[PDB]
């Protein structure tokens, strides 16, 4: 019979297990025999305390580098305010050592863990590319709890070198099966930020992860958008418990918070899943998340049922990760067919937006051709438009099966007159639907002001298979 860990703070790790069912069902994976042995995870952040008493036994120098100072040692820089504690807190969530009388345990407490020191300095395109592309035939899973500013007025994503690093990773990384990139969806809730305005979370090559509070609510910092895939627990109000992990200066903390704590927990659960089937591709892993995640008892006002009967929300994606279900379904999973891509240029002429614009188009989804798609994965609406105040726009897209995705909600702080320049808004909400038929795009002015602009390009890009 499985014996659960004896670490002193393990009883406070409410999100791992318990009899209440408000947990990620991690103990059920442990009891099936999966604890992370043989899997390598790298934390891309401000450094990792490699000599920490709850990390030293799992530390892997092959998964580590210091891009800020150009050396192999990722030790954080010590300061009076402990500014560089962030990466060490994230690492302990994944792979803190078990049964050693220190702090708590990681989700994958027998995995190997490294860190890339890259946030303690100016974060250029080259700095990002060198970190995402580190040792891609040794590191299996990359975790990133950082991104563009969450001020509610920024539109930004990976530049050329960083985008090239994503494509190289999913194509040639992990022996051709593809690197796994896990991303925190953002902390911009108080600013009414949208995570579709962040190109890292909006990318098809990352698994974007949101947060839920202990009592099952949408936290104050949460950002809603259609590109989010799933959810893990994190912090909420001061009556709700928080995350337990390793802290700087060889300490233990019980107050790790925010979107930053959600992505590491997802990375650990994905590490358990890879141990259960090391042949899973980067796309296999997203299929498993979609099928096994759990909406039950997460509170939101926008839960909707999509074309294949699955519940989906802009705050939570397909719901909470379920580690026991992930490892069980992985063991006999059949690899998906190669990915197809069908490009449909919608507009014949530019269209004035005015107060409201609706664009309807019936598509065949490349019928008769080698890239015919009957089983959708991701879909993008790539839009070029001008407008006088960007944050007054709201944008929706409806699939032929009737699923309505919010591509952009109103952003009160976004005063920009710069519009969108071929920006690829992405939705996960129509996964496994047939994309043949009528699609509808809606753009509307949500304010009483007399705003003006023009839509000049709309490309619908479909990804998926025909089996």
């Amino acid at each position: 019979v499985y014996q659960e860990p004896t670490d002193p703070k393990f009883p406070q790790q409410w999100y791992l297990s318990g009899v209440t069912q408000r947990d990620l069902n991690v103990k059920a994976a442990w009891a099936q025999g999966y604890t992370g042995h043989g899997i390598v995870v790298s934390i891309l952040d401000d450094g990792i305390e490699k000599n920490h008493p709850d990390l030293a036994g799992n530390y892997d120098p092959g998964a580590s580098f210091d891009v800020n100072d150009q050396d192999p040692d990722p030790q954080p820089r010590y300061t009076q305010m402990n500014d560089n504690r962030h990466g060490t807190r994230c690492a302990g969530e994944v792979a803190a050592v078990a049964n050693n009388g220190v702090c708590g345990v990681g989700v994958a407490y027998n995995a190997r863990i490294g860190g890339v020191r890259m946030l303690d300095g100016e974060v250029t395109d080259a700095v990002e590319a060198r970190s995402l592309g580190l040792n891609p035939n040794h590191i299996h899973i990359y975790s990133a709890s950082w991104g563009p500013e969450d001020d509610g007025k920024t539109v930004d994503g990976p530049a050329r070198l960083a985008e090239e690093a994503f494509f190289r990773g999913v194509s040639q990384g992990r022996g051709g099966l593809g690197s796994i990139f896990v991303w925190a969806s953002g902390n911009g809730g108080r600013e009414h930020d949208s995570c579709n305005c962040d190109g890292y979370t909006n990318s098809i090559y990352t698994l974007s992860i949101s947060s839920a509070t202990q009592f099952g609510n949408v936290p104050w910092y949460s950002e809603a958008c259609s590109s989010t895939l799933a959810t893990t627990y994190s912090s909420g109000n001061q009556n709700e418990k928080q995350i337990v992990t390793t802290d700087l200066r060889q300490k233990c903390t019980e107050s790790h918070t925010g979107t930053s704590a959600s992505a590491p927990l997802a990375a650990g659960i994905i590490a358990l899943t890879l141990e259960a089937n090391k042949n899973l591709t980067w796309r296999d892993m997203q299929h498993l998340v979609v099928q096994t995640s759990k909406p039950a008892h997460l509170n939101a006002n926008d839960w909707a049922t999509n074309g294949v009967g699955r519940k989906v929300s802009h705050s939570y994606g397909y719901g909470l990760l379920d580690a026991g279900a992930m490892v069980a379904l992985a063991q006999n999973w059949t690899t998906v067919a190669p990915q197809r891509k069908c490009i449909i240029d919608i507009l014949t002429e530019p269209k004035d937006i005015g107060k409201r614009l609706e664009v309807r188009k019936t598509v065949t989804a490349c019928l008769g051709e080698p890239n015919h798609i009957t089983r959708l994965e991701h879909a993008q609406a790539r839009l070029t438009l001008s407008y006088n105040r960007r944050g007054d726009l709201a944008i929706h897209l409806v699939s032929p099966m009737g699923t309505r995705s919010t591509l952009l909600a109103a952003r009160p702080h976004d005063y920009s007159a710069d519009g969108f320049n071929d920006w690829a808004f992405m939705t996960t909400h129509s996964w496994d639907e047939d994309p043949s038929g009528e699609w509808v795009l809606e753009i509307e002015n949500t304010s009483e002001a007399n705003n003006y602009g023009t839509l000049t390009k709309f490309t619908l890009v479909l990804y998926g298979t025909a089996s």
Binding site: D45, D46, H86, L119, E122, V123, T124, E128, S145, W146, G147, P148, E149, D150, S260
Partner: peptide, 6 residues
Amino acid sequence: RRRRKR
């Protein structure tokens, strides 16, 4: 105003 934030 950093390009990227924790």
